[PDB]
Amino acid sequence: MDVMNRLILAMDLMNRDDALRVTGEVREYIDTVKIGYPLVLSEGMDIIAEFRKRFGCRIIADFKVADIPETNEKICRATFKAGADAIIVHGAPGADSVRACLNVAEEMGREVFLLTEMSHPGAEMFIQGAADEIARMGVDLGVKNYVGPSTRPERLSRLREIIGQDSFLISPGVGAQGGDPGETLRFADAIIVGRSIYLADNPAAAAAGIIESIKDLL
Amino acid sequence: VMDVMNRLILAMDLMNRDDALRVTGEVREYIDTVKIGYPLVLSEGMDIIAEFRKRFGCRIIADFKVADIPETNEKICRATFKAGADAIIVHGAPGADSVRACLNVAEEMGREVFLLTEMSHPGAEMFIQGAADEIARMGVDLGVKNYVGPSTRPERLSRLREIIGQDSFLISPGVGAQGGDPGETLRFADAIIVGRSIYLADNPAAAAAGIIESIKDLL
Numbered sequence A: 001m002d003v004m005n006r007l008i009l010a011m012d013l014m015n016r017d018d019a020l021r022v023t024g025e026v027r028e029y030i031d032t033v034k035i036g037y038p039l040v041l042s043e044g045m046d047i048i049a050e051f052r053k054r055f056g057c058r059i060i061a062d063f064k065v066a067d068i069p070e071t072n073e074k075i076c077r078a079t080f081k082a083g084a085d086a087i088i089v090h091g092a093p094g095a096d097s098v099r100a101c102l103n104v105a106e107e108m109g110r111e112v113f114l115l116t117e118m119s120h121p122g123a124e125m126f127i128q129g130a131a132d133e134i135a136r137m138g139v140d141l142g143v144k145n146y147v148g149p150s151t152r153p154e155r156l157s158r159l160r161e162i163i164g165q166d167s168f169l170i171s172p173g174v175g176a177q178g179g180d181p182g183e184t185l186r187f188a189d190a191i192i193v194g195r196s197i198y199l200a201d202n203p204a205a206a207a208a209g210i211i212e213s214i215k216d217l218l
Numbered sequence B: 001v002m003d004v005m006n007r008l009i010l011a012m013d014l015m016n017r018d019d020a021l022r023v024t025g026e027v028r029e030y031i032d033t034v035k036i037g038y039p040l041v042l043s044e045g046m047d048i049i050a051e052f053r054k055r056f057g058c059r060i061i062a063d064f065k066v067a068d069i070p071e072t073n074e075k076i077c078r079a080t081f082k083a084g085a086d087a088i089i090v091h092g093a094p095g096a097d098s099v100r101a102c103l104n105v106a107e108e109m110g111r112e113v114f115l116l117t118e119m120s121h122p123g124a125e126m127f128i129q130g131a132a133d134e135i136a137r138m139g140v141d142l143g144v145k146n147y148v149g150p151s152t153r154p155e156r157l158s159r160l161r162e163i164i165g166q167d168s169f170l171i172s173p174g175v176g177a178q179g180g181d182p183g184e185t186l187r188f189a190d191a192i193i194v195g196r197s198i199y200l201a202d203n204p205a206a207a208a209a210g211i212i213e214s215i216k217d218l219l
């Protein structure tokens, strides 16, 4: 996956007008948008098609898929029907649940991203201790795309080590949660950035500034 | 706790409006509590919750297995309750802050959180099972009153009931298609969740009635 400026916008605004306006303001800096449940549950799955129509951007559906295999299959089918290019799936529920998603993605010409360790403090309670094993499970299953935490660069580096340089790794927690753009890109192919851009006084300037700070990495 | 008619919750995972409305309508004399998940919501929109309320007046549990960071969890719960869900199901695996975020919104909005501890499918054994007792204890510490645990592992369901105490509300999926037994599950759960055994039946009303007949002495 070729992400412009190694920067993925996490569009978690919850009304269509603001989401479209802000995305439009930063469109020159990106070609990949992560759309999650905050926007989808507020404005409907049709918002994915609207983004493709307006911006011609790649769409990653950040749905943290975390159900049994049968339900995971249905969620992936509905998601890809809406035009998502990729979907993010939790590794915690195990191999069968991930495989169900991989199967649908293969059938519809899409990608699965496996979320290993999460970026927030609560991740330390249960997920962190399983995260290396979840990553190895991804490798065993032939997963090529992964998500890991900007807020813990040593854990992000370990995830990169497990999955290899050939795998694709994206990383949230940059900015608002305390992760540094440039340090994160030592290990991740692309950074995910939400609030630092979409809550900024001037989202375009915010995006431009982040990119300026990683200029030598592009 | 919510008064679930016949201790039976429909998992309405059909993916088109017409079929989902037909089946739910056909079983409404038996079931006043419906679990609506992403298969139906992502296919038909959040307004499906509105339509179920309008047509059936059933309680709605939004099975969204909320599993994000606290900030995103809050947004998901807000959007879900705004649409009229009575309750939302939240994963415990992402830890205490993520659960607390959901509890805070539920409190502010006058709705309920259900905490998913262990899951019912085989893959649950890899990671979630080993954390489930602690996830449950965490729920109790946070003041969670409603829980979800697996019909398919009676020994685990029993332990989770012990941890949360008799006063907590426990619902349990995996009954029927996944192999769990209705009556056995109701030894520990307040209510059973049933999807395919009802919604794929030639006569969903008859399927629901049959399940209820089998647990008649437990009502």
Ligand SMILES: O=c1cc(O)n([C@@H]2O[C@H](COP(=O)(O)O)[C@@H](O)[C@H]2O)c(=O)[nH]1
Pocket (backbone or CB within 6 Å): A010, A012, A036, A062, A115, A117, A118, A119, A120, A147, A148, A149, A172, A173, A174, A175, A176, A177, A192, A193, A194, A195, A196, B068, B069, B072
């Ligand atoms: O571990 C993770 C995984 C995520 O997908 N995310 C997501 O990435 C985005 C982070 O946004 P922000 O830059 O505003 O902190 C949110 O949409 C969040 O749901 C995360 O923060 N941590």
Ligand SMILES: O=c1cc(O)n([C@@H]2O[C@H](COP(=O)(O)O)[C@@H](O)[C@H]2O)c(=O)[nH]1
Pocket (backbone or CB within 6 Å): A067, A068, A071, B011, B013, B037, B063, B118, B119, B120, B121, B148, B149, B150, B173, B174, B175, B176, B177, B178, B193, B194, B195, B196, B197
């Ligand atoms: O551990 C769990 C948690 C669930 O919510 N579920 C949900 O409960 C329902 C089970 O449906 P069924 O009776 O068709 O197996 C599905 O909606 C599934 O997503 C589950 O099966 N196992």
